[PDB]
Structure 1
Amino acid sequence: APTAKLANGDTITGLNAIINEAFLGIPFAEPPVGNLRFKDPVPYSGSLNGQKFTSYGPSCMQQNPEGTFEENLGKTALDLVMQSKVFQAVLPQSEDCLTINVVRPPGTKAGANLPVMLWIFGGGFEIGSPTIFPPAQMVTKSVLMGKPIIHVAVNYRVASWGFLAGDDIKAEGSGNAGLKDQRLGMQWVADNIAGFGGDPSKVTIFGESAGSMSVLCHLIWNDGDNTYKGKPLFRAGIMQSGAMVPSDPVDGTYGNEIYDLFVSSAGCGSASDKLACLRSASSDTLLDATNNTPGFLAYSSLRLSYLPRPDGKNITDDMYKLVRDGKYASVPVIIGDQNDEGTIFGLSSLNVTTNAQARAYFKQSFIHASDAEIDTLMAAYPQDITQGSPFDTGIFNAITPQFKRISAVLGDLAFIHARRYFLNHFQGGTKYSFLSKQLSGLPIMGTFHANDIVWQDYLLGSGSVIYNNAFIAFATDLDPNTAGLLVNWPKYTSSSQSGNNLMMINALGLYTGKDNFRTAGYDALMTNPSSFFV
């Protein structure tokens, strides 16, 4: 069977899956249970010598995406699904979840020095795990290209377990636990991947949605010092939908509001030492308490209950400011979007149908925005159903008179104009950007959020030449054009540059275009980004 020697000299065994060799479920941290809840992960101390790693371990605990303090049929439906024996059997969860997964080409030996693609899964900072992002399609393609890579997927804590915030968390130094899980995994790769056939000096970190925003967070982490034992932890990044998190600090308003609701819901409202009270609760009590706070499909939508926040320590400030001010690691990057990122999320506010109600939803969601800033937003993103998302669909997809508008705002603030802001300010390396229109015409959803996961991990489609081939080429050669694409991918310098600067995808293939759309919306959101933070 496949084997590998770890840094400490432990020899572990993996799975010959014929199409790849997999070392799955390797612990990299002590179980963050009991009194270690919410805290920085502790490096794994024991020996793994002679053990077998041939199946994925459990996910970290998962929040109901329709969780909320309200009662409703959607919360109930997903709860029944996620609690079923059937679900629990296929996708088990546990607080003892800090595992890492290494999947390499067949026959790869220690010393192969292959480039490493280190995947950070996305799930709203509230669900997901490595288990549901199969690496085989990427690994197999890499071999076919003559550019073999090793895929590494790190598990990290989500929801309350990973992103609890508020004053107590800040004062203890425990902000952004799940990002610290990711970071420790990156360090694990630095120290251990060589014995699997990987080159620790050729790690590309990549992720989608919350995983893409995590990649950004890794760029600005420790004001962009990405060094470990004197060497950079990664040499490139790929961001599939998401850059800066538009978030207030850990000890800000909504981090404390969620913390107070979580504490109360967990039965710890009378405690003088609330974090100790939480650490003492049963796992079920914390799960129920988490599901009593909004999940990312609830009405609150992308005003997330759990997400990375500046903590004044490892994320030292407003992430837009960090990028503006140069506080990032210097690496080349790819960053891109799906055309209609916001549509799934717009399905969460379908009781908002009038202009006045849309205004009230925006004001509830954007607690820092002035009436004048909301006016500017609502001028830039008008009710006119032809101008919203799914873009370029005219009078189609009008579920309500506001759905396409709300979708457009959501998609641009959370992902598409966030990307443009990043690209206009980031000078740390060569930049490439894409915009997919692969599913134009798909009713209601359009080219929706995370469809790229399908084409990257599950099926072959026109976009697979980007999500697999170009990304492998980038990870290998720091240039996606060594993939031999049928269209040259131009470098991105700014949204004002004279020529085409986006790699575009449609159902029939590749072409190029410009990042010069919805400029009024960009100006409304990005003149003062912190006015639209959550």
Structure 2
Amino acid sequence: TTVNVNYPEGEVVGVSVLGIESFRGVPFAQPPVGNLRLKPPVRYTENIGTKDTTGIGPSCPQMYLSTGNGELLFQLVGNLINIPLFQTATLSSEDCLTLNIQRPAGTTSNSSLPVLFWIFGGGFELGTNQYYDGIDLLTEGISLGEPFIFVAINYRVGGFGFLGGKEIKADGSSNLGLLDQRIALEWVADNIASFGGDPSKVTIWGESAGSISVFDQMALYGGNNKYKGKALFRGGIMNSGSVVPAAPVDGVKAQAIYDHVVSEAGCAGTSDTLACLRTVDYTKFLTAVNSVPGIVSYSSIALSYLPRPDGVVLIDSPEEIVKNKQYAAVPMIIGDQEDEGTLFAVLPNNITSTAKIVQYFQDLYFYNATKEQLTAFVNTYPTDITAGSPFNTGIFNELYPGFKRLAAILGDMTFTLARRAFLQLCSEVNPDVPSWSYLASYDYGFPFLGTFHATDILQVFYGVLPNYASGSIQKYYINFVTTGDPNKGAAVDIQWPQWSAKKNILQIYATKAVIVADNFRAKSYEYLYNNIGIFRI
């Protein structure tokens, strides 16, 4: 059972399964290939005709594992995965600037439904909309009387989306993944009504790197989120990630990354290194950008690829963008999984003392923090086995001596207490703009990892397993997309208090939720807030 949409730019053949029409792999910009590799995305000028989108869309090139750093087993797999046969088997190519659109059966151009615009996460190195199907979430929306359009996009990750250095900067080529996101937003503004969505009711939603991207979209161009005189979105939902302090795109880390990629791509000593890169064949290029340290490794959260201030797209370090009121402030929901850091403390298992955590940070994370400052920060975290993450689990879950501590720290600085700082600053500069925040605990007891990073994809995005957490959060979100307030629309079980009222949040278990003070780990949070700037990665 198929279904045509015609829109200004082309038309589209989707599938209608159990009450849901799905269009997968709708092109939104020109394939960033040859000429257009390592260049900003470009809109389609001419009509692109009729594409069948009853299939499975492509992914952008992935970096699951480094081809040049980390344990040999991982390097081996990292290289094997890059061979054409596998790239082809996974539908991954530079031809990836496509999105998916899912809607309830029978929706028409006449329809004026709210839009839910999803940005996947994968440490800015991997990820794709291929395994983010909005069926369960849209199904709940219909069951609640609050139907919506679901849009899930691809964007360039790894060295295809976030290569930096002085050359990229001058080419105006910084932060391509963000621009892919932005241009996907503008495409939605031009085309989504044809699909029966209200382009004036777009809510952007992301997890991890996608959540950070949500804040970045709010920040883009000094907070100018306007397209043809109208805002590109009206609300934002952030799961695990917001502001990421970061040195400039032409900074030392990014330049070192760029020079290494250029060496591996076989482009050193050439006249235009950046021009040369676009000459290198895919496989060789993929291998070279993937050669740097990857998230699955000792390096962990000290990412090789991430958004960095360029001065136009990302005008400044995100924390300063907030303090200076240079972001589109919109109603927003932000949350964290209770144990965000555990996954990221698994590999750096030789970091087992304050002194070693400090060295680790000075080696890879924070070039503009003194040994003294970092030592102070880490010392706000007890060595006490019981104080670490997974939180509230006693002497248990210590994978290695110092694990729960490191997990606590990595999880707080990057996501959970970072979130509170974000909330605090936003409440100060834009007090009239509402926010709601929550903590997820529905996997309490899960050995070693607890309610760890990305568990929300299962429990919330897919509703597995079906329980109080699944119902409550889904309903809050769908409410928020519909009304711009999680407590408005369908009837809610607990009134979610605005964060700036008392600085309370919802803590959501499998069985129930409760309102609690967002003041845990106060000394750690204090130091981070008062010293946010030294934490630029």
TM-score, normalised to structure 1's length? 0.95
The C-alpha deviation readout for 1:13-67, integer Å capped at 9, x for no partner, is: 2111223101111111111112211111011234233332112321000013355
Compared CA separation, residues 242 and 198, structure 1 to 2 (3 A): same
**Aligned residue type for 2:268:** G
Q: Name the CA distance, whole Å, in 2 between partners of 1:178 and 1:473.
A: 29
The C-alpha deviation readout for 1:293-341, integer Å capped at 9, x for no partner, is: 0111111111101101111012111110110111111310001100100
**Aligned residue type for 1:37:** R
**Contact conserved, 2:443 with 2:451, CA < 8 A, in 1?**
yes
Q: Name the CA distance, whole Å, in 2 between partners of 1:524 and 1:58.
A: 44
Name which of 441, 444, 447 aligns with 1:443.
Answer: 447
Q: Which residue of 2 aligns with 1:524?
A: 527
Q: Name the CA distance, whole Å, in 1 between partners of 2:51 and 2:31.
A: 18
Q: Which residue of 1 aligns with 2:504?
A: 501
Kindly state the Cα deviation for residue 378 of structure 1 after the two structures are TM-superposed: 1.9
Kindly state the Cα deviation for residue 530 of structure 1 after the two structures are TM-superposed: 2.2
Q: Residue 38 of structure 2 aligns to a residue in which SS?
A: coil
Q: Which residue of 1 aligns with 2:477?
A: 471
Kindly state the Cα deviation for residue 78 of structure 1 after the two structures are TM-superposed: 5.3
TM-score, normalised to structure 2's length? 0.95
Q: Which residue of 1 aligns with 2:185?
A: 186
- 1:130-141 equivalences under 5 Å are 130-141=129-140
Q: Is structure 2 residue 425 aligned with structure 1 residue 430?
A: no
- 1:105-504 equivalences under 5 Å are 105-364=104-363, 365-426=365-426, 427=430, 429-458=433-462, 459=464, 460-482=466-488, 483-493=490-500, 497=502, 501-504=504-507
Kindly state the Cα deviation for residue 87 of structure 1 after the two structures are TM-superposed: 7.8
Kindly state the Cα deviation for residue 88 of structure 1 after the two structures are TM-superposed: 4.9
Compared CA separation, residues 385 and 121, structure 1 to 2 (3 A): same
**Contact conserved, 1:373 with 1:524, CA < 8 A, in 2?**
no
Structure 1 range deviating more: 127-136 or 395-404: 395-404
Kindly state the Cα deviation for residue 362 of structure 1 after the two structures are TM-superposed: 2.0
The C-alpha deviation readout for 1:247-292, integer Å capped at 9, x for no partner, is: 1110111111111111111111222211011111111111111221
Compared CA separation, residues 80 and 191, structure 1 to 2 (3 A): same
**Contact conserved, 2:469 with 2:511, CA < 8 A, in 1?**
no
Q: Which residue of 2 aligns with 1:515?
A: 518
Kindly state the Cα deviation for residue 186 of structure 1 after the two structures are TM-superposed: 0.3
Q: Is structure 2 residue 62 aligned with structure 1 residue 55?
A: no
Q: Name the CA distance, whole Å, in 2 between partners of 1:356 and 1:260.
A: 31
Kindly state the Cα deviation for residue 80 of structure 1 after the two structures are TM-superposed: 4.3
Q: Residue 500 of structure 2 aligns to a residue in which SS?
A: coil
Kindly state the Cα deviation for residue 94 of structure 1 after the two structures are TM-superposed: 0.3
Q: Name the CA distance, whole Å, in 1 between partners of 2:404 and 2:69.
A: 27
Q: Name the CA distance, whole Å, in 1 between partners of 2:67 and 2:391.
A: 29
Q: Name the CA distance, whole Å, in 2 between partners of 1:20 and 1:5.
A: 18
Q: Name the CA distance, whole Å, in 2 between partners of 1:441 and 1:465.
A: 21
**Aligned residue type for 2:527:** A
For structure 1, the 5+ residue unaligned runs are: none
The C-alpha deviation readout for 1:326-377, integer Å capped at 9, x for no partner, is: 1111310001100100100101201223443222112212221112211211
**Contact conserved, 1:166 with 1:252, CA < 8 A, in 2?**
yes
Kindly state the Cα deviation for residue 383 of structure 1 after the two structures are TM-superposed: 2.5
Compared CA separation, residues 84 and 288, structure 1 to 2 (3 A): closer
The C-alpha deviation readout for 1:128-156, integer Å capped at 9, x for no partner, is: 11111111011100000000011001110
Kindly state the Cα deviation for residue 71 of structure 1 after the two structures are TM-superposed: 4.6
Q: Residue 14 of structure 1 aligns to a residue in which SS?
A: strand
Q: Name the CA distance, whole Å, in 2 between partners of 1:121 and 1:479.
A: 23
Q: Name the CA distance, whole Å, in 2 between partners of 1:342 and 1:70.
A: 20
Q: Residue 357 of structure 1 aligns to a residue in which SS?
A: helix
Q: Residue 256 of structure 1 aligns to a residue in which SS?
A: helix
**Contact conserved, 2:39 with 2:176, CA < 8 A, in 1?**
yes
Compared CA separation, residues 440 and 70, structure 1 to 2 (3 A): closer
Q: Name the CA distance, whole Å, in 2 between partners of 1:171 and 1:31.
A: 22
**Contact conserved, 1:68 with 1:295, CA < 8 A, in 2?**
no
Structure 1 range deviating more: 349-358 or 124-133: 349-358
Compared CA separation, residues 143 and 318, structure 1 to 2 (3 A): same
Count of residue pairs the alignment pairs up: 528
Q: Residue 59 of structure 2 aligns to a residue in which SS?
A: coil
Q: Name the CA distance, whole Å, in 2 between partners of 1:150 and 1:27.
A: 17
**Contact conserved, 2:125 with 2:157, CA < 8 A, in 1?**
yes
**Aligned residue type for 1:491:** Q
**Aligned residue type for 1:523:** E
Q: Name the CA distance, whole Å, in 2 between partners of 1:312 and 1:150.
A: 34
Compared CA separation, residues 316 and 404, structure 1 to 2 (3 A): same
Structure 1 range deviating more: 64-73 or 137-146: 64-73
Q: Which residue of 2 aligns with 1:2?
A: 3
The list of structure 1 runs, each at least 4 consecutive aligned residues, that deviate by more than 3 angstroms after superposition, is: 65-68, 77-88
- 1:68-79 equivalences under 5 Å are 68-77=68-77, 79=79
Q: Residue 463 of structure 1 aligns to a residue in which SS?
A: helix
Q: Name the CA distance, whole Å, in 2 between partners of 1:444 and 1:158.
A: 29
Q: Name the CA distance, whole Å, in 2 between partners of 1:419 and 1:142.
A: 28
The C-alpha deviation readout for 1:139-191, integer Å capped at 9, x for no partner, is: 10000000001100111000000000011111111110010000000000000
